[PDB]
Amino acid sequence: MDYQEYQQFLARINTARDACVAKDIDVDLLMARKDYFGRELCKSLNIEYRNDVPFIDIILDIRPEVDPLTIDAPHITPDNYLYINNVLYIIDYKVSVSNESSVITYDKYYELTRDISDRLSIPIEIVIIRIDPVSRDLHINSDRFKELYPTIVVDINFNQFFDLKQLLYEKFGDDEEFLLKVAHGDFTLTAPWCKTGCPEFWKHPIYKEFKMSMPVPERRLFEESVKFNAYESERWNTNLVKIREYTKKDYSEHISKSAKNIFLASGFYKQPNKNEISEGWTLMVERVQDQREISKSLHDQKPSIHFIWGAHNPGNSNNATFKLILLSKSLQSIKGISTYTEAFKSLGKMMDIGDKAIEYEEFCMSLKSKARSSWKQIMNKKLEPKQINNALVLWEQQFMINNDLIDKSEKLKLFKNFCGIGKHVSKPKILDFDDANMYLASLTMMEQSKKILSKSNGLKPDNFILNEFGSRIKDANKETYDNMHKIFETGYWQCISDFSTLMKNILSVSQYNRHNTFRIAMCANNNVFAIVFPSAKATVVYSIIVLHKEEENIFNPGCLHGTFKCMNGYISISRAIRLDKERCQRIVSSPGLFLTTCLLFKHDNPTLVMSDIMNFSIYTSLSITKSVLSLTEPARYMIMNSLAISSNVKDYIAEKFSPYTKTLFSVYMTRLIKNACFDAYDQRQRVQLRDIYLSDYDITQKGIKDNRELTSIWFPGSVTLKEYLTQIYLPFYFNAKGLHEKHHVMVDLAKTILEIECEQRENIKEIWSTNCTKQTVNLKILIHSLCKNLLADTSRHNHLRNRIENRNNFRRSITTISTFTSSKSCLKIGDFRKEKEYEMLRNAMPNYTDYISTKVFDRLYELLDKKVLTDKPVIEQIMDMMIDHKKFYFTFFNKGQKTSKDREIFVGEYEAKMCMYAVERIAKERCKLNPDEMISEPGDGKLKVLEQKSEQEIRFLVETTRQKNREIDEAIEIEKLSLGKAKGLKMEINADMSKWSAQDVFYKYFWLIALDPILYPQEKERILYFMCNYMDKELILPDELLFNLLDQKVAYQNDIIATMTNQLNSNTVLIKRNWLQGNFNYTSSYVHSCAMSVYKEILKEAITLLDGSILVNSLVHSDDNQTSITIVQDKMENDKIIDFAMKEFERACLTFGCQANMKKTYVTNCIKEFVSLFNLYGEPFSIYGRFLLTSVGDCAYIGPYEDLASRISSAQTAIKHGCPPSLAWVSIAISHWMTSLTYNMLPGQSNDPIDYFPAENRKDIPIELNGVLDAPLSMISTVGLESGNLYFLIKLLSKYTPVMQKRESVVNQIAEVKNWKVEDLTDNEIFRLKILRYLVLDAEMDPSDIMGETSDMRGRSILTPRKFTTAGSLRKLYSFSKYQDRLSSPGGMVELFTYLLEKPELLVTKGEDMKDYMESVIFRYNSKRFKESLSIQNPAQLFIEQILFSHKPVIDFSGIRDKYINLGKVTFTEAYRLLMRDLSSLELTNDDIQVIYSYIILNDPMMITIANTHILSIYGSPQRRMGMSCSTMPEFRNLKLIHHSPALVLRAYSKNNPDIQGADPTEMARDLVHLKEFVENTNLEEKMKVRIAMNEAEKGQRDIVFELKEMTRFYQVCYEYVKSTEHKIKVFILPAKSYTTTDFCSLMQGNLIKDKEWYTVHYLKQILSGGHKAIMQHNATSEQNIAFECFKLITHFADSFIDSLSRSAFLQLIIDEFSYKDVKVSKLYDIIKNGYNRTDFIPLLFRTGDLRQADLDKYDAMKILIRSLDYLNNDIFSLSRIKVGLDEFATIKKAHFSKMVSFEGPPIKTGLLDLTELMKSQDLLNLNYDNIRNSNLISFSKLICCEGSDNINDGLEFLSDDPMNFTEGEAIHSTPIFNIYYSKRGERHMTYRNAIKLLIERETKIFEEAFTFSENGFISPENLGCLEAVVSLIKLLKTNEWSTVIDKCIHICLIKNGMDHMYHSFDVPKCFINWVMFREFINSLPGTDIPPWNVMTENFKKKCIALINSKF
RNA sequence: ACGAGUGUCGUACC
RNA sequence: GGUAGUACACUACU
RNA sequence: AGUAGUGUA
Ligand SMILES: [Mg+2]
Ligand SMILES: [Zn+2]
């Protein structure tokens, strides 16, 4: 941890050049890690630190009286010992990831100490403390030791040692001897998976083709390699080395040629520019005109928004019946003649209620009351229309189509030519997007929309989002709050809210619409209506009707049918719209999308116009068509390529960009993109980089400058680069998934697949070539690279085969693998004609391969039941299937993604799944070792990897450039020399691969299989036979696609499908070279990595020819490549290098069969983009807008709480990806609004709970009771929706704890709960506490409990609606048929249930046996929810059903009442009322409050830590986020009590045998003991037994299913208790790098409070608590950390800012009276003295005496006499630094000065400076000399306490005169130009005192000339009289900080001028209490306009005038 | 009419 | 020409 | 363990 020791290790690594000493380096590194952990553990435990203390020594120490030689002490050396309570504990520190060494050392030490334990009559305990370096989880075996130490708070980081190990291994990676020397064990191969290999593989036609393709020597080499057995051979790498040596000549020749190409390359690469963009645009428009039908008519446009809107009418009433009457009258009174005017008038007559409004209301109310009285739908009773006036009414807003009221001809005209009901190869018609008239029409449309919608609403901006989240959003960003207020005031919000409400009403009324009825939908607007036409994927037909007084005052986005005159104005009818419920639901959610988009685009940008942003967002948010889809996604490639250094944007536009402009908005956005391309080319040079700050240990202040110089894209303004990237990339997420149509997408996907297959069949005939032919692989280079990479990878780890089998469950059963037991679909081949009934297709097409789709688990059940599969180890069965399954069949379906063209998705059969599983797991485990591979990297860690690569490339650039240009810089401190100096080049190739799986040479994987060392020859033969049979796979065409292709009746021109299928005579097509998408990810990625390694070699050699330095980092996921190249050379310009690098990148991709997408491949100098993730310049960046937009996404629609928890997930992910707090809060508000809208809980609505509960606002109601979340954003991110209860409890603590403990730790504050008075609690608090006590917890719980259930062990759902829903067909499931047979079997259920009781662990864990699996599969069918999931369900239909059933009795209140002490289903409102009634009778007591606190907070260490962070937080100096970084969330529960896996522990507990398969005998015993203790102390077994007994007695018969359910919850709780370290991968973008839990919490809290700036957070006490997950914590930690921080801060502050002489007196004075963090510093000093950590404060102790020479001896042991020390420190006056020897220096570690604000004490008055305020000073404590000398007199005036000082020179004497540090910045001279700033030791003239002197002189001169009221000067007697007047004035009035700072500044000026005597003699002038003339004088004050004091003097005068006027 | 489409579709049926 | 089972939301500062 | 959702390729 020590930085000097880190430097020492770095020097050892750098200077080392022998692999024999690198082992010494690594061993020393491991010892340093162990000793560091031991020292930190001893500090935490507060025990004296020892290492390898002799056992005889410890025996003598514990028993000095006994004579030595009484017994031979064992030679073992314990790390440390501890003797308390007559028990000796032998402690051993271990820093390992495993327990093998721990257990063997435990056994050895125990055996060797038994004899001494018996003799000396002392029990000896062997305690092994083990820490896991990668996840800091502590493991302790001795429970007695853990009893001694209840809280162990070891919080340390091992990242430094990992970095050194990585540096050593990368330096000596090329040395195979070093790898062998550091290898663990030898090369070991497990037992062969198969006993025999395929003999028919050699006869396979595919193998014959491959063999004939290869030349003869390669055929021989392939046969030898596949027939090679590593275990039999003397060396495993015998054949690998032979092949590598054979191919070395060709490999070296290829590398040398490719390197020689650098000279032949010119400087001209594919630069994007305006000419290329224009030519590409011309080619694109030509291609689009050829492929489409271009229309120049505006009347051919399609609706941009399927809606028309008009402002409301304040004069008219908003009652529903009045609106209906008004609509009927307006429809009837249409004047004029038109096509449908008579139909509209007839409809208005049909809906004419007349004057019988009361009768209509009564009829509708009676119907609704009848409907709502039943949980189920009312059946068998027919609704009969009632005639009211001329209206035949069936329901509210439902009317008959009366044949008498409408002519038949008019009715058919309307229904067919208008609504399309009863209605009934050319090119798709699209508008001309390049036509000037068409673009002018689009501009006119957008201008009209802006004009109509920019006006004010005229109504209150009050709404749910604002009311419930305005405070949070305002505190986060007042500007965001103001933007929201403006948005809600404008008319865009009213229009989109009206459209959403109206569309929800349309969806509600369309469910029960009949064929002869039409519905009327109404919204809050009294002028906007909807008429829903009859309808039967369900569709909705609606027409929007708008009433407006003035014509042309309507908002028409190309949806209007016509505007007609009526009574009292005009009526406008929109054209009929037919939409899918999926698009309708998006429209309903659209307000959230609109608000999110507007706030994202406007955030932190004053140069943008909110009107323009909303004008764009209203169209993108409501876009539900493919027209905008065709533009959003290609825009990324177009604009990003244009900004790039090298890109083929011209070819991209010409060949791929295909705008689909069916709408005027699409035309407008096409023009926007076109302009943005040229602008992006023009403005690529305005990107600038921040000044890098390098500390040589970490990088801070890195990235890209924030200057708004780039032009905005979609709307006028200026943006930063980050905002520009957001504007480029966010629009892709405006698209909607599932917009495609199955018919067309199946046709296109089949066409693409068959076209690729046909092209491969015809054109592609060569497999191996040397000239980089398309779809061809260079054989020699491939083989050589594969050999090299395989050698390196398998040399890295010696047990690769064992690791594969262990991690992939190869040795375990088939039923224990998730991918083989899932509910995903799989293909089944065979005769299934009966189930499928299709008949016509079967008869008409002979060669039809019959197939059916089934679930994976069902297929596994079938194969197990038919004995095709067994429960033997899975790998043996997999290889058996590799031989048996000769024919592979696949089918495909469309993904339905959000891109313009859908993606084909392939489904395979079970045997193919298993074979590919084996191959892919082998490839995966070899990819894990390779650093370049990125699929093996867990998700979201790729951001951290990108950051690390960028940081090391920055460091390499700086170091290499400085090292090379040292000579030139020395010569400078010449222009000709500067010309010839070396320059740095940085290159980022963000690349894409074209047709990764479609066009790939599958033969290159044969070599990967054959050259693999870890496989046996028989395994290789079987796998190669599988691959050969895979290359003969057949694609089964889908039945629906075949149906449509057979129902055409007109022959297609060139039907590729018919050609490939023999004129539709077969449904199967043979696919050979296209390994199917997604099946061979790891293998393809490995070969991609090998290709990039060859590229790296080529680049390194080529740069070697240039005598330069290069660093190449390549990241490869599957087909997405991120290659960054850093070059520092001087021979040639950068253009030649860029051209050469790009040409060789393309050539290297083509060499290995890959093909880079040059259209989508672009080169940048700074920006990295690997997988939707960006690294701007060392600084991580991500588009969190996608997570922000997914806040309104679909959910399970289970209930109000379940729905909310799903969307808070998206909010939290957005927070993790860098979303600012205000936008995160907006997303949370939108999620709450969406849920409340779904369940009709919005304010004022029926299910709104605010009235029924004692709460002022919905923040007071619990989430489970339908409140809104109220908690800090850091809490929401960390604990995740438990934050509601946590925040409520913390607020209760902060409100009711006594003042003495108010600033104590959470455990102490909870211990003080017994003193609470329950009578003082408010009604809301009482209600919430009762809810927590009785609804969340159990009545049996007692405050005396020591262990209890954690919040993760219990659910939170209370009010969940129930639905009467049919299960579905489920006919095709063989397992379901077996389950039905078993159910119909006599009593089979009792046996199956009995088996599940006998093996209860099967309920929660996977079974390890076929019988166990088959029983579980049969059992799951009992649960209704599983069957519902099995049936396909539409989320759109579920959402509408939840809306409709909101008033029906759905809540089962019996279950809720069963929760507390001791009917029919109930509605939401009645449930609220009943819950309040039930809770009224219950009582609450201090005992109950203690139970709540103990069971909610004291259980979880994470909950305790979060509560401590909230209570004890101190917020420091604000600062702008300069350089961000990634940091993963650490583990909050470090202590581990269970070692074994939870499944194994549960299996052992179900039985009583600690000895289980795969379970360590003795290790499982303690886990079983712990689990039994947990069960007994929580009384789970007793509670379950009592519950089942009571239920059995109540029912009268044994409810066996109830017993199963009880066992399920019991084992669920047991599983949650015994769950081990999950170690989730959760990374965060944070202002700084965090290493420990406290650092992470500080960074989270400081980052998630304000949008503008982030704060430094330190904690008053120690936040972390040492405890276990389910054990109560009643012990708080010590204050030693506070003492350490205090005295480190004190020593270093005194050294830095105090003169050498005054330092000791300063220390003594501050020790005597001051206090740190509410703790007296004398007490902290006593803690340090009377403690076992005194070697960290040797200089501090020396200055205060102490030492006693024991500390010096201990320090020497860590590596010196007292008098020698005293003599040596004669010249040194440093409090923090002392010299024990002539060169040895004992020092105290530094602490950040931001914590100095925690010191409180009496003033330290010396000279005129009061040092207390200096410690409290914020500006003047900075270490940099420049920053100190450049501070202001406003800050400096705080330190002035003169009381009669004459000279500032003697006043400032009490300041440090040692040299300070200053930041010197230098340029780098690289193609991306940037400056690095590094602090360096300054010379003598720059000291703290000198900086203060310069500050004083400059600022006082400025202030003097600012306040020379008289012309003579500052010292003139008249000016002095004016100063006397002003000081008397300010003394006479109330003190203000303006007055104080002005007084201090004038005082310091007078001290400089030596006017102090009169200053202290200032009094009221004799000419002056005439307040009138004081006012006259101050109003006559000649205030100057000097800029710093201009605002200051005016404010001071104004405040004085206001105060003196308020006085009178 | 609307959704989709350089694949004949959905658009309630006999 | 005839046929076309199918119980309910919003109801508002507008 | 099952189910749902989201992001990624
Ligand atoms: Mg990419
Ligand atoms: Zn003074």
Residue among A1029, A884, A1009, A916 nearest A204 (CA):
A1029
CB A984 within 8 A of CB A1869: yes
The Cα–Cα gap between A1923 and A1908 comes to 10
Resolution in A: 2.9
- Closest ligand (CA of A1117): 1
Ligand 2 midpoint to CA A1391 (Å): 97
Measured to protein CB atoms, the chain C nucleotides within 7 Å are: 4-14
Q: Which residues of chain A (534-573) touch nucleic strand C at CB < 7 A?
A: 534
C-alpha–C-alpha distance, residues A1015 and A1023, integer Å = 10
Residues in Cβ contact with A349 at an 8 Å cutoff, skipping those fewer than 6 apart: A328, A332, A390, A405
Asked if the Cβ of residue A521 lies within 7 A of any atom of strand C, the reply is yes
Cβ-contact A333, A349 below 8 angstroms: no
Please give the torsion angle defined by the CA atoms of residues A151, A152, A153 and A158, in that order, rounded to the nearest 10 degrees.
-170
Query: Which residues, including other chains, have CB under 8 Å from residue A1067's CB and lie 6 or more apart?
Result: A845, A847, A848, A849, A1036, A1037, A1042, A1061
Contact between the CB of A55 and strand B at under 7 Å: no
What's the A1957 CA to ligand 2 centre distance in angstroms? 8
Can you read off the two tokens belonging to residue A1166? 């700074």
Q: Please name the amino acid found at residue A394.
A: L
**Residue–nucleotide distance: A986 CA to B10 C1' (Å):** 55
Instruction: Report CA(A459)–C1'(C13) in Å, whole number.
Output: 6
Strand duo A517-522 + A528-532: pairing: antiparallel
Provide the CA A1442 to C1' C11 distance, Å, integer.
Answer: 18
Contact of A1036 with A849, CB cutoff 8 Å: yes
Q: A860 beta carbon < 7 A from strand D?
A: no
Fold of A3-182: Restriction Endonuclease (3.40.91)
Q: What positions of strand B are covered by protein, i.e. any atom < 7 Å from a CB?
A: 1-13
Method: cryo-EM
Shortest-distance ligand to the CA of residue A946: 1
Burial of A609 (0-12, 13-18, 19+ CB in 10 A): middle
Q: Is the CB of A290 under 7 A from strand B?
A: yes
Ligand nearest to the Cα of A1122, by number: 1
Hits for CB < 7 Å against strand D across A residues 1205-1234: 1206, 1209-1210, 1213
What are the DSSP calls for A185-232, one per residue?
Answer: S-------S-SS--SSGGG-HHHHHHHHHS-HHHHHHHHHHHT--TTT
Task: Report whether A476 contacts A1649 (CB < 8 A).
Answer: yes
Q: Residues 1533-1562 of A near strand D (Cβ < 7 Å)?
A: 1543
Q: C1' nearest to CA of A748: which nucleotide?
A: B7
Instruction: Report d(CA A573, CA A1994) in Å as an integer.
Output: 62
Structure tokens at A40: 């930190």
Q: At what angle do helices A1987-2007 and A1971-1979 cross, to 10 degrees?
A: 160
Within A 338-377, residues with CB less than 7 Å from strand C = 367-368, 370-372, 374, 377
Can you give the three-state secondary structure of A78-102, one letter per residue?
CCEEEEECCEEEEEEEEECCCCHHH
Given the DSSP bridges, would you call strands A528-532 and A138-140 parallel, antiparallel or unpaired? unpaired
The letter for the amino acid at A1530 is P
User: Which residues, at least 6 apart from A1515, have a Cβ–Cβ distance to it below 8 Å?
Assistant: A1645, A1646, A1649, A1655, A1656, A1657
CA of A549 to C1' of C3 (A): 44
Q: What does the alpha-carbon distance between residue A284 and residue A808 come to, in Å, rounded to a whole number?
A: 50
**What whole-number distance in Å separates Cα of residue A153 and Cα of residue A1532?**
11
**Could you tell me the distance, in angstroms and rounded to a whole number, from the CA of residue A1845 to the centre of ligand 2?**
6
Q: At what angle do helices A1283-1296 and A1486-1496 cross, to 10 degrees?
A: 130
**Chain A 1520-1549 residues in 7 Å CB range of strand C:** none
DSSP code of residue A1400: G
Q: What are the C-alpha distances in Å from A226 to residues A333, A438, A736, A883, A1006?
A: 89, 67, 50, 17, 10
CA of A1457 to C1' of C9 (A): 29
Contacts of range A182-189, beta carbons closer than 8 Å, 24 or more positions apart: A182/A22, A182/A23, A182/A26, A183/A795, A183/A798, A184/A798, A184/A799, A185/A798, A185/A799, A186/A798, A187/A230, A187/A236, A187/A798, A188/A798, A188/A799, A188/A801, A188/A802, A189/A230, A189/A231, A189/A801, A189/A1014, A189/A1016
Residue nearest to nucleotide B5 (CA to C1'): A428
- Token pair of A1898 as six digits: 């400059």
Q: Tell me, in Å, how far CA of A1455 is from C1' of C10? A: 31
- Name the closest residue (CA) to the C1' of nucleotide C3: A515
Q: Say which residues have a Cβ less than 8 Å from residue A679's Cβ, sequence separation at least 6.
A: A711, A713
The closest of A1708, A1745, A1700, A1619 to A1889, measured between CA atoms, is A1700
- Rounded to whole angstroms, the Cα distance separating A1530 from A1637 reads 6
* Smallest CA–C1' separation from A323, nucleotide: C11
Sheet with strand A1715-1716: strands edge to edge: A1719-1720, A1715-1716, A1799-1800
Name the nucleotide nearest A561; use CA and C1': B1
Quote the ligand 1 centre to A1146 CA distance (angstroms). 15
Q: Which nucleotide is nearest to A425 (CA to C1')?
A: B8
Q: Give CA separation, A1809 vs A1705, A1729, A1801, A1804, A1955, in Å.
A: 15, 32, 15, 8, 18
**Separation between Cα atoms, residue A931 and residue A170, nearest integer Å:** 11
In window 418-447 of A, residues with CB < 7 A from nucleic chain B are 418-429
